[PDB]
Amino acid sequence: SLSRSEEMHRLTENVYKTIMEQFNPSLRNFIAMGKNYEKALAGVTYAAKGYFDALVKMGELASESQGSKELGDVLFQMAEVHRQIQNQLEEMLKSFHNELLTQLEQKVELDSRYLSAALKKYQTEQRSKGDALDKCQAELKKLRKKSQDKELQYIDAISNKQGELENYVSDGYKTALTEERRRFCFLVEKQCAVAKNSAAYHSKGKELLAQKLPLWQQGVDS
Amino acid sequence: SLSRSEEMHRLTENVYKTIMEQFNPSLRNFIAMGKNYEKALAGVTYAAKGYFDALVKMGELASESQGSKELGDVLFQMAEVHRQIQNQLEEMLKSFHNELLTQLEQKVELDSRYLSAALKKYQTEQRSKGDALDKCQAELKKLRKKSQGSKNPQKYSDKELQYIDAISNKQGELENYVSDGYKTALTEERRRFCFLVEKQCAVAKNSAAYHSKGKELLAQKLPLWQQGVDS
């Protein structure tokens, strides 16, 4: 390591600062934004029922009519398809709250605070092994300049501190990057987890309509 | 129990009555729930945007990361799939509005008033033919009791045959008039339930296109995103 092992230290620092300065505040925004989105979804849930019952009611009247009885069956079936799709939506929504939103809230609420302490702790021991090396060198200097094997004790003590430091930094940086990568990953995963539940929503709708649509269409063209 | 003409006449009156007293009111309630449902979805549309921006921003922060840049793309793709799907919703929405709701709205608005005039016109006309028949048949009975068999003058017998002729004609016109009203009644009734189903179909057709566009975008990318997670 040259005088560039300074960069590695400085980098560990920025990684921690950036998670606090940008990552968490933006994630919070993401959460709030997601919640707003969640709230609108729940809205569709309540309104869906009013519509459902109105379909059924048209269905009943048709089933009670003088000569449009067969159409009552079409209406009921349409209401039925709506009920099932509406249920797959609620499944997705529940998965939106329980696996993405609630999770992220919990993992972000105190995260900056701990990263702060984690960073401070890192710098502290980093500053410690540095001050210990300097003072150790400020001695190998007081000796070499005074001698104008006690020297062998330092040159070999310096190199040990130089090693124990170079591998404390490199070590911090590794952890740091894990810290950064892990937070994005977690986000992506849960997103996938809900996107997967989303798929089961569209697939059921596509499926359900595929079966019934041609029949409803024929009942009309009848 | 006044023949098939009286029974059919009654069904005509009940058919118009059911369209005005139940079909139309329940249809207005249907439109009303349709609109509440429409607003709800519209609500989703707006929130969708903010969510979109958020995703993109996390994507940008990831592309500027040191060792998470890869994930930046997975987020951007998710943002994309979401934006597209969101547009497909806007569409189902537009058809839900332009083909069903607005359509049922003007159809229903002044309907019972026209159905009401239609009913009255039918009732009035079928009552004239009915009264005309009864009077006619009444003057006949009145004429017969003046009969003196073998001695009835030609003036007499000719008049009787004139009435028999007229009764036969009025009698038949009335029957068809009622018989014709009934067919039209069933058509008025039939047509509305049918129009509802049609529009419901059009919206369903739109709904399939949205749901299907969703399954392709996700079934296509999900497995790949599933990999980026695997790291």
CB contacts, 8 Å: A88 with chain B: none
CA A37 to chain CA centroid, Å, is: 16
CB B79 within 8 A of CB B52: yes
CB contacts, 8 Å: B39 with chain A: 47
C-alpha to C-alpha distance for A212 and B39, rounded to whole angstroms: 27
CB contacts, 8 Å: B218 with chain A: 195-196, 198-199, 202
| Number of other residues whose CB lies within 10 A of the CB of residue A37 | 23
C-alpha to C-alpha distance for B83 and B217, rounded to whole angstroms: 11
CA B57 to chain CA centroid, Å, is: 47
**Which residues, other chains included, contact B119 with Cβ-Cβ below 8 Å and sequence gap of 6+?**
B13, B16, B17
C-alpha to C-alpha distance for B29 and A108, rounded to whole angstroms: 46
CA B229 to chain CA centroid, Å, is: 50
C-alpha to C-alpha distance for B167 and B135, rounded to whole angstroms: 10
Shortest Cα–Cα distance, B176 to chain A (Å): 20
Shortest Cα–Cα distance, B103 to chain A (Å): 16
CB contacts, 8 Å: B61 with chain A: 22-23, 26
State whether B50 and A65 contact (CB < 8 Å). Answer: no
**Which residues, other chains included, contact A168 with Cβ-Cβ below 8 Å and sequence gap of 6+?**
A125, A126, A129
**Which residues, other chains included, contact A146 with Cβ-Cβ below 8 Å and sequence gap of 6+?**
none
**Residue given tokens 């309540």 in the structure block:** A46
CB B75 within 8 A of CB B53: no
C-alpha to C-alpha distance for A97 and B229, rounded to whole angstroms: 20
A211 CB within 8 Å of a chain B CB: no
Of B84, B24, B227, residue with least CA distance to A58: B24
CB B204 within 8 A of CB A209: yes
C-alpha to C-alpha distance for A73 and B120, rounded to whole angstroms: 32
Q: Interhelix angle for B69-95 vs B154-230, to 10°?
A: 170
Q: The domain containing residue B57 runs over which residues? A: 1-231
Question: Residue A29 sits in a domain of what CATH number?
Answer: 1.20.1270.60
Provide the chain A residues 42-61 that lie in CB contact (below 8 A) with chain B: 43-44, 46-48, 50-51, 53-55, 57-58, 61
Residue B149 backbone class (left: φ over 0; alpha: ψ -120 to 50; beta: rest):
left
Of A183, A56, A98, A88, residue with least CA distance to B65: A183
C-alpha to C-alpha distance for B76 and B83, rounded to whole angstroms: 10
CB B189 within 8 A of CB A67: yes
CA atoms within 13 A on the CB side of A209: 21
DSSP B52-106: HHHHHHHHHHHHTSSS-HHHHHHHHHHHHHHHHHHHHHHHHHHHIIIIIIHHHHH
Structural tokens at position B157: 């017998």
**Residue given tokens 């009787």 in the structure block:** B160
Q: Interhelix angle for B24-63 vs B111-144, to 10°?
A: 160
CB A173 within 8 A of CB A14: no
Q: Alpha-carbon dihedral of residues B151, B157, B159, B162, nearest 10 degrees?
A: 170
Q: Which residue of B has its CA nearest to A56?
A: B30
C-alpha to C-alpha distance for A3 and B66, rounded to whole angstroms: 21
Question: How long a stretch of residues is chain A?
Answer: 222
| Number of other residues whose CB lies within 10 A of the CB of residue B153 | 9
**Which residues, other chains included, contact B41 with Cβ-Cβ below 8 Å and sequence gap of 6+?**
A44, A47, B89, B93, B96
Instruction: Report the domain count for chain A.
Output: 1
Alpha helices (runs of H) in chain B, residue ranges in sequence order = 3-18, 24-63, 69-95, 102-109, 111-144, 154-230
A118 CB within 8 Å of a chain B CB: no
A92 CB within 8 Å of a chain B CB: no
C-alpha to C-alpha distance for B34 and B18, rounded to whole angstroms: 22
Structural tokens at position A87: 């249920």
B218 CB within 8 Å of a chain A CB: yes
C-alpha to C-alpha distance for A158 and B208, rounded to whole angstroms: 73
Structural tokens at position A33: 């934004």
Q: Alpha-carbon dihedral of residues B113, B115, B120, B123, nearest 10 degrees?
A: -170
Q: State the amino acid at position B52 in one-letter form.
A: F
CB A103 within 8 A of CB A190: yes
Cβ-based burial of B62 (10 A; exposed 0-12, middle 13-18, buried ≥19): buried
CB contacts, 8 Å: A192 with chain B: 222, 225-226, 229
C-alpha to C-alpha distance for B161 and B168, rounded to whole angstroms: 10
Which structural technique was applied? X-ray
